[PDB]
Write a protein that binds this DNA or RNA. Structure first.
Lengths: 93, 82, 99, 79
DNA sequence: ATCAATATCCCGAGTACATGCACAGGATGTATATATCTGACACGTGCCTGGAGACTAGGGAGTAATCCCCTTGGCGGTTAAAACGCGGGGGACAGCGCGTACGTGCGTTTAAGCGGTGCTAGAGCTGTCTACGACCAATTGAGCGGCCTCGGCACCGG
DNA sequence: CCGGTGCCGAGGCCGCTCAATTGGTCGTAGACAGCTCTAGCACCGCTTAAACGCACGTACGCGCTGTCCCCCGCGTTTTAACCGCCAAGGGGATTACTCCCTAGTCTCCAGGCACGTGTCAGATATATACATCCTGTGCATGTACTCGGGATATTGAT
């Protein structure tokens, strides 16, 4: 095996849609915002912008994680790579 | 069932995002860790987005608020206003 | 016959000695000549304040120390203790300079 | 030719502050490149600020302003 | 499972330049009074965000077989480290002068105010008409099949 | 006894045969062009008034410029722990299948808060006289760097 994954890899790098389902993301955002203040209302464009920015952040994170994994002569990505990427980028330690 | 909505970010969604990132193999411990990271990011934007809503004495969070919040973190977003 | 130290203990000795003091490492005159020649390569007949060149020196040293710290993390990530240029390239790319 | 003024023991000292035990012998020639490039940007600004004030002397505040525009802030030099 | 050889820390003494305080003063912080418009408050309004219903089905959750990448272990070659001697250039002090900051005088240049008027904006329903969905016929490529030719071993000949 | 020769076994060639891929055509529908005021409104033309921006000298320090001395760099040596390569055990992430379920569509409903206007009043710009707090200058002295010698570790080799 090892080629159906590359099929996806090539497919998703061309299409430009939202890879996360909208309703769970909306529920997550509402629950996260509940703590700061109760009884909030959300503009739909605000939620869409949130989801777009989060997806872009995750894509960049996984790009750097893949670079980290390749550095150590591996193909599988593990949290040992994500922690290193976050540390050296500057969001932690 | 009473389940936290962070688990609403399904495993296939994370796999799709990873495949868009260009990765061949995915270990099984990424799935719980990535969600945690996704929490932290939303803990540094919505917090700001609410504060602007405080300063305008409004009750509805608008897209301009989140765009300004992302702008100050060196992560400017295009095409959603501003 | 003469007492010889193991390869590696002098390394940690130098680490501890240098990580406590805060003097300038690079010799002042070569750094001044380098910045002078670079400036003349851009714009000839320039005058430099001594405080300006020492601030350039301190900025460069801070940059290099941070870069080498990141390089050390990269090298340890690869199950190694010696630093090779691939670690520096990886660090520089993830930080977002080079690429 | 003055980039060679950054001698090898100086690079060793800079590495030793960072906390590394062993240094490859070919690191220096690449490391002198980074010092060559990172320094070619602040001067780009430092002279340019100098050239705005009709003056041809690089004061200690121009380098501070350049490093601030680039994202590296330093204290103690009139910042 | 310790003893020699270094390196480091601790303490004491001669020494000095930089900290901290007082002085003269000057120019910016302060008190008083006036003008006035920016923003608090109230009001209506109507956009739209939140709640629930039913139906479709793309997508996720669960299971099972498994080949592969991960990791541990072992060995050879060598690239760097530690310490010696040799050698050069960084480092520490006086003389010029050309740059930088004030001081003084001038006029060009933006702010402000008031009519004048094309001009960008919004909803109007406008109509086309690219571009998103569905179907279908082109090449590219690998997994197979038939047949022929070459080479090794067992059988018979002298 | 050894050797020629038939029989069988394997390697090489060629070719379809079939299953998976990708550009071309059909088609319909919501959304980019494009008037149409309008609308009031920013932008332009046309004036002056004041000030800051600019240039000329001119005082005055802070960068370049020349001379002795060792401290750090250069260069050599040996040797050893590490890098890099190889190999095998096995776990787990992969891939494919069926089954469940909540995303997605859209429809309907409706009350909360965005959003604009109208009113008016007090907080803030602004000018002037008052005055005192911060700042450049000068100077005593002491906390801290440096040198030297004796503790306590701190490693390596038997």
């Amino acid at each position: 095996p090892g080629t159906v994954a590359l099929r996806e890899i090539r497919r998703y790098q061309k299409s430009t849609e939202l890879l996360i389902r909208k309703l769970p993301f909306q529920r997550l955002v509402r629950e996260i915002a509940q703590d700061f203040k109760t009884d909030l209302r959300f503009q739909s464009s605000a939620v869409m912008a949130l989801q777009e920015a989060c997806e872009a952040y995750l894509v960049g994170l996984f790009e750097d994680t893949n670079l980290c994994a390749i550095h150590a002569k591996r193909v599988t990505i593990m949290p040992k790579d994500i922690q290193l990427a976050r540390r050296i980028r500057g969001e932690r330690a | 069932v009473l389940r936290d909505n962070i688990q609403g970010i399904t495993k296939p969604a994370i796999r799709r995002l990873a495949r868009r990132g260009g990765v061949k193999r995915i270990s099984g411990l990424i799935y719980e860790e990535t969600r945690g990271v996704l929490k932290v990011f939303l803990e540094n934007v919505i917090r700001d987005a609410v504060t602007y809503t405080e300063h305008a004495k409004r009750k509805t969070v608008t897209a301009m608020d989140v765009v300004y919040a992302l702008k100050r973190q060196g992560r400017t977003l295009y095409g959603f206003g501003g």
